Structure 1
């Protein structure tokens, strides 16, 4: 199978995590799937898989070696507060990313031309996804998850 060598590692107590460079050796098989790399790593570190997030990879011009960077968080409860909204939909935890631009630009249109009376109403119709909403969803992953 694969052979991973961990390369450059820092210790960030601030965001409570350790950052490391990864060098996957797959001489034979094609680039490793982030997923599979996620676990062969968690095993060498001996840490829950979901508390280890791996991002950015490459693949030297045909040679079976891929470089990448990963993250080790101690509390998935920390990981959930720090990681980016986009990395979460990626583990299928946060979800969708609907097209805000267009409509938001159009509401600006109406609102900029009204008095408070209606404005409030309009606002009660701008494409969802509040941050207040992002949190409640983040929170639910919090309680409902426990293990390792």
Structure 2
């Protein structure tokens, strides 16, 4: 199978995590799937898989070696507060990313031309996804998850 060598590692107590460079050796098989790399790593570190997030990879011009960077968080409860909204939909935890631009630009249109009376109403119709909403969803992953 694969052979991973961990390369450059820092210790960030601030965001409570350790950052490391990864060098996957797959001489034979094609680039490793982030997923599979996620676990062969968690095993060498001996840490829950979901508390280890791996991002950015490459693949030297045909040679079976891929470089990448990963993250080790101690509390998935920390990981959930720090990681980016986009990395979460990626583990299928946060979800969708609907097209805000267009409509938001159009509401600006109406609102900029009204008095408070209606404005409030309009606002009660701008494409969802509040941050207040992002949190409640983040929170639910919090309680409902426990293990390792």
Same-fold call, TM > 0.5? yes
Q: How many residues are matched? A: 148
Unaligned stretches of 5+ residues in structure 1: none
Separation in structure 2 between the aligned mates of residue 79 and residue 40 of structure 1, nearest angstrom: 20
Q: CA deviation at 1:79?
A: 0.0
Distance in 1, Cα, partners of 2:66 & 2:77: 30
Q: CA RMSD in A?
A: 0.0
> Given the two structures, how large is their TM-score scaled by the length of structure 2?
1.00
- Residue 103 of structure 1: CA displacement? 0.0
Q: CA deviation at 1:80?
A: 0.0
**d(CA) in 2 for partners of 1:49 and 1:62?**
29
Pairwise CA distance, 1:99? 0.0
| C-alpha distance in 2 between matches for 1:108 and 1:74 | 42
Displacement of 1:107: 0.0
Instruction: Determine helix, strand or coil for the equivalent of 1:146.
Output: coil
**Structure 2: how far apart are the matches of 1:79 and 1:124?**
32
5+ long unaligned stretches in structure 2: none
Report runs of 4+ in structure 1 exceeding 4 Å deviation: none
